[PDB]
């Protein structure tokens, strides 16, 4: 019954590995699939997980058109977007969100051992290239900012958009590992990467503070039910357990 | 024009100190008044600040009846609750909230140098009394919990006719200072209090994670308008500045 | 039989909480205490845990005299030092160390939300006080450094009868929470603190890279044996489990 | 004077490319050769570099005899071993090691674009082959491991004896490049290899944590001197510069 739009993004949504045959929903796994399971059992709904065709989170182009999971909701093509979808004021204008299931902030993924310590440092040089995932909320934060440092950074990433803006986080990560590039990435995803790719680290602190919410078309009769369910899972300690399960690891030596 | 219900709690809402007599909204100062001033400018509304008459945040009795700021919104005696009001699943069933303007978790406030290291420490002893603000979300978190350790804690704090609970955070801070008592208090508040009193400290880390949001009655058109304005204030760095200003 | 010198330092060595009578080794708990049981079982020795009387890790004063746990090993007053004792070149000239049981680097503990991004930022000002634990290896790092940013930091933390230095980590943490002060602290301790004290954070990356080792006096019959045991425990995954056990926690929202 | 045993391994020990022929020590370049030069100047000694004849790191045979670089030291055939030689307890019982000059952990080197994410993914199946460098610490780690996942992986990589265990890292790399195969390799090497070959990637995180040390024969008159030198080189930011240099 319910159509769920989502996007590949480790460890939130990933393709499951099995020698066995996977049917529909079982093709996927991750933090967001476990959350989506909880939600369907608590609220009593059936659902069909569909990956967003353009593989984008969602941004409004200059024409005024949206793409990504946000457009799927606006156009009523999906009933819910269950993904690390960031809650922002530009999106609240066109779709609804549940209270957040996880908090995060934009920060920087880069290599260890360099003199770079802040966005300010990146803004003050051009040797190191830097950017964010195209049509993501990080890119939009930079595009719409009136703060000097971030305007200068947007001017830089914008002029190089074809190299600076990446298709997705996986591409951004490979770019940091193999070229002199820093990715503007959400903190939770940075935490995940840096406990595996031990030559990478977070640079500086968090640039902002926000959260991931389940998206719904404006006025959906599931928004509040979902908000209530998430808030209750939080209070029962089940979201912490989910987080530990997907982020758990041996880490890296210092 | 808009009727705003609120509650006294430092540094969110405090009586402005002055020689001459202050009237109306001018009697109040704090992080939430700055936030409210920002929202009124952005949104273009006038407002009137009224302290909730029963002095409570809001909980439901076993009869199904609410009190505090929550009941003011439910009963349509206020348009907005602009206070350090926690977003909880029990309150979402009766009122609406904007997305959070601040994040926090339940933690423990106690005097320094003692024995206690965490809520588990507290749950297995009775020498140190412990409690929470009556009819606040912290109290309700323990009351509704199915986690054995929190169930044990709720049993201890609700017996003896709830003598372990306090009427408000100030009565809680004074009790922590005058006797062997630990207050289950929200982290943002503990961070303010422990900067102001070197006798006090936070024990353990956070028990949970949640947010404060502006409360409105269900279906209010201001719900989303305020969500957008708060989210923009966050993104422009304005909320961070307000926090710095009030947390010293 | 064996005398083990140690020092209180959360969560490595702490007094156990108990309304009952606690004697001998049972009076203590913590990561180092679990390490110590493993070692006593693997090597088969009996032991008595004894806090270092001066309560210091150990440094050599301008007069030339060692103090702390280091001095206890030199004077054959302790058979082992089991604690978060940093392996350093100055110490290695006077005592022996097992291979590292844990890695770490010096970094900065300060409050969240400021413009300070690195040691460089602190070295160029005076309004923000900064320092380290007196007579520990981080103090000796700044005292012995020939790197100019660090030489400038030593000059500061070292002035006015060393007012910027603290007696222990606890006092340093309080000073950070209650005054405009930044503590130079090892990364493993910062991790523990910042996961409980949500308004505090690590500033910049790691200044250096080192490890903690079990210390013994030069010529110790248990020297190589202890080293074999640590390496094996590491290989068997036991040290990772001990770390997860003592650092486990809920974390802070973003 | 001093005979230093080593083994070719990028980017620690490699042959310098030159138009004119190169002789003796000048035939080699790399992180480990730079470390050796620094040790030479700190301690004041002359040395000669001789790749270990068998080209192996070290592993004690199914009897009790040692091969490769470990062997060389045991038999006093080499004064030192300056190479990416892993500090392990098995080796600790027959040779001395300095304190580590570099940290790392076993991880997986595979091809990109697959649902394979960890060692658990490799272990629970058998279509994709996986192995390690015959007679290195990685092999020995799986061999001596009592951890269920790793014993099962050693079961597989041993019954697949020939095909699964490779001669050296180059052969392993090649096998990953031209076959459905995942090589178990130390993280520092995978970091190097992957920067220089975009079709290769690290799979999952680190299996363990350990270090590389300069090896010497039991009770060598240079043990303590080398340890102190390496510790001082780190503290003066020099081992860090050598790392940035060879890994770009
Ligand atoms: N969570 C982001 C995607 C990642 C990013 O923008 O950095 C979004 O919802 O657009
Ligand atoms: N913020 C709480 C009040 C304080 C507390 O309960 O700790 C509430 O909304 O009820
Ligand atoms: N671990 C240090 C003490 C703490 C510090 O110096 O930061 C030592 O062995 O001296
Ligand atoms: N560094 C390893 C060789 C490479 C490996 O075993 O993965 C050793 O000393 O044995």
From Swiss-Prot, chains A, C:
Residue spans, topological domain Extracellular: 115-254
Cystines in this chain: 198-252
Tissue: Expressed in the olfactory bulb (at protein level). Expressed in subsets of neurons throughout the developing and adult central and peripheral nervous systems. In the CNS principally in the medial amygdaloid nuclei, medial habenulae, pyriform and cingulate cortices, and Purkinje cell layer. Also highly expressed in embryonic and adult dorsal root ganglia. Expressed at high levels in the trigeminal ganglion neurons.
Domain of life: Eukaryota
Positions of modified residues (Phosphothreonine): 194
Compartment(s): Cell membrane; Postsynaptic cell membrane
Phosphoserine found at: 158
Glycosylation sites: 199
Binding site for L-glutamate: 84, 86, 91, 137-138, 186
Family, as annotated: Belongs to the glutamate-gated ion channel (TC 1.A.10.1) family. GRIK1 subfamily.
Stated role: Ionotropic glutamate receptor that functions as a cation-permeable ligand-gated ion channel, gated by L-glutamate and the glutamatergic agonist kainic acid. L-glutamate acts as an excitatory neurotransmitter at many synapses in the central nervous system. Binding of the excitatory neurotransmitter L-glutamate induces a conformation change, leading to the opening of the cation channel, and thereby converts the chemical signal to an electrical impulse. The receptor then desensitizes rapidly and enters a transient inactive state, characterized by the presence of bound agonist.
Other facts noted in the record for this chain: The postsynaptic actions of Glu are mediated by a variety of receptors that are named according to their selective agonists. This receptor binds domoate > kainate > L-glutamate = quisqualate > CNQX = DNQX > AMPA > dihydrokainate > NMDA.
Subunit-structure text: Homotetramer or heterotetramer of pore-forming glutamate receptor subunits. Tetramers may be formed by the dimerization of dimers. Can form functional heteromeric receptors with GRIK4 and GRIK5. Interacts with KLHL17.
Protein name: Glutamate receptor ionotropic, kainate 1
Gene expressing this chain: Grik1
Portion of the parent chain present: 448 to 821 of 949
């Amino acid at each position: 019954t319910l159509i769920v739009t989502t996007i590949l993004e480790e460890p939130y949504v990933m393709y499951r590995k099995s020698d066995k045959p996977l049917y529909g929903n079982d093709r996927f796994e991750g933090y967001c699939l476990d959350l989506l399971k909880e939600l369907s059992n608590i609220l009593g709904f059936l659902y069909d997980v569909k990956l967003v065709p353009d593989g984008k989170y969602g941004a409004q182009n200059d024409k005024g058109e949206w793409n990504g999971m946000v457009k799927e909701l606006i156009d009523h093509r999906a009933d819910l977007a269950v993904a690390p979808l960031t809650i922002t004021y530009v999106r609240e204008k066109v779709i609804d969100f549940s209270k957040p299931f996880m908090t995060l902030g934009i920060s920087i993924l880069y290599r260890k051992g360099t003199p770079i310590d802040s966005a300010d440092d990146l803004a003050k040089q051009t040797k190191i290239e830097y950017g964010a995932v195209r049509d993501g909320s990080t890119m939009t934060f930079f595009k719409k900012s009136k703060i000097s440092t971030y305007e200068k950074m947007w001017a830089f990433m914008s002029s190089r958009q074809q190299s600076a803006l990446v298709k997705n986080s996986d591409e951004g990560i490979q770019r940091v590992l193999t070229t002199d590039y820093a990715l503007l990435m959400e903190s939770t995803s940075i935490e995940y990467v840096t406990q595996r790719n031990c030559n990478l680290t977070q640079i500086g602190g968090l640039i902002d503070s926000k959260g991931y919410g389940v998206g719904t078309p404006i006025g959906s009769p599931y928004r509040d039910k979902i908000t209530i369910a998430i808030l209750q899972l939080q209070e029962e300690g089940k979201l912490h357990m989910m987080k530990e399960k997907w982020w758990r690891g041996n880490g890296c030596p210092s």
